Design a protein around this nucleic acid. Structure first.
Length: 49
DNA sequence: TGCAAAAAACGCATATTCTCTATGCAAAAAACGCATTAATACGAGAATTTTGTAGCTACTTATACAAAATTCAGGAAAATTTTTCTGTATAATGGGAGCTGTCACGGATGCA
């Protein structure tokens, strides 16, 4: 699932997330700009392929 | 249902008399004295005699040297267990495991 998600000013954000009954988390997001990256068991890479 | 009143009983005249209060008799206890005998205790004699005191004597022990006949503490082997070290030869070629929902604060850096 997926964070609605909000900010320091108001203008808001979007971000996504995935986790089964057991395993990693597929997590997604929005740098203001209909962008993405993919973060999983890393929390170290604004990486989006 | 008021008594006046009669006869027999129930009350003022003595015999009887009979429990009754009253002294001399008498018989055996008792206790006192004549007293007698025996026994409870004083007198003398010399006999046992135990206790109290001295010296001798036998037992008991105070003490001075020490290796008795026995105990023990190390010392140095084994005895067996155990410990540390060294060694055994086909190929084998990048590691899993949660962190992802806390709120707020204080610097400390990075990033244009």
């Amino acid at each position: 699932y997926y964070k609605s998600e909000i900010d320091k000013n108001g203008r808001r954000t979007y971000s996504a997330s995935l986790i089964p009954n057991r395993g990693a988390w597929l997590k997604f997001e929005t740098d203001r700009n209909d962008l993405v990256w993919v973060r999983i068991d890393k929390t170290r890479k604004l990486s989006a392929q």
